[PDB]
Structure 1
Amino acid sequence: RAPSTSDSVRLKCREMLAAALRTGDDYIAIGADEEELGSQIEEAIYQEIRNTDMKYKNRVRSRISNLKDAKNPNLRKNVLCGNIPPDLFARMTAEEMASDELKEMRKNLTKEAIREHQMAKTGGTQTDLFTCGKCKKKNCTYTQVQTRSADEPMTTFVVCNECGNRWKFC
């Protein structure tokens, strides 16, 4: 039992959602009432927006398109078998609900790679020779600059980044 509406627009949006659920006739091998469920979906959406706004229409329409996916009928089957209530369906569980293999894996591995673009980032000049005179760690850096010179000859300057300590070969 779901509340009917007297608005022409809401009624039409309901049959469109029912029409979207009728795709592939999956509802048949379950025998569920896709029109009532669609009405509950629409009502549940309405409970959040409470307007006939574009943002409501877009949200319904994006629900519709995601239900119309030919690459993932198993999502629709999951909704049709009542494993996903309409109030849940009202809000996405994923940025373009794609759970049930294929796209979620692809989206996840894509989430791996874009997070991979930060990981090490990039660091370390890299000699790891001398040991620090403060925090006693051997992870250290060296500078080589100005040759010959007059009174401050080319010396090896060693800095411990690890605590900003700086010394020379001395």
Structure 2
Amino acid sequence: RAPSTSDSVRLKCREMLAAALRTGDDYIAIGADEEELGSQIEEAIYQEIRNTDMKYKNRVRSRISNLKDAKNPNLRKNVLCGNIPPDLFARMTAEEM
């Protein structure tokens, strides 16, 4: 569903987001497509920021750090299950996460 990209920076960020989504192995039992979710999250970030510079990388990094948060597994699970859509997650504030 997310558009493809041929931008190497965007591709790496999609892969990094997919990897963060694998935290704790929850994605397997849930049956989530972690690569597709990663692409949808990245797409929403790129659509809002519209470049791959500092603000873009910061946003990607903050989504990743929260997905990897051992203290907040329900955040990741909500994204994996689709309770939180990827475009919402892309723009969620730290407070909201």
- With structure 1 as the length reference, what TM-score do the two structures score? 0.54
Distance in 2 between residues matched to 1:47 and 1:2, nearest whole Å: 11
What's the secondary structure of 1:58's corresponding residue?
helix
Structure number with higher relative contact order (C-alpha < 8 Å, ≥ 6 residues apart): 2
Q: 1:83 deviation in Å?
A: 0.3
Partner Cα separation in structure 1 for residue 64 and residue 34 of structure 2: 13
Give the aligned CA root-mean-square deviation in angstroms: 1.2
Higher helix share: 2
Q: Deviations over 1:115-161 (max 9, x none)?
A: xxxxxxxxxxxxxxxxxxxxxxxxxxxxxxxxxxxxxxxxxxxxxxx
Q: 2 CA distance for matches of 1:63 and 1:77?
A: 13
- Shift of the alpha carbon at 1:94? 4.5
Structure 1 residues 57 and 94, CA gap change in structure 2 (3 angstroms): closer
State the 1:95 CA deviation.
2.4
Taking every aligned residue pair, what percent have the same amino acid on both sides? 100
Q: Which has the larger radius of gyration?
A: 1
- CA deviations 1:72-97 (Å, max 9, x no partner) are 1111111110000011111115426x
Q: CA deviation at 1:29?
A: 1.3
SS of 1:90's equivalent in the other structure is helix
Q: Mark the runs of 5 or more structure 2 residues left unpaired by the alignment.
A: none
In the TM superposition, structure 1's runs of 4+ consecutive aligned residues that sit over 2 Å from their partners are 93-96
What 5-or-longer segments of structure 1 have no aligned partner? 97-170
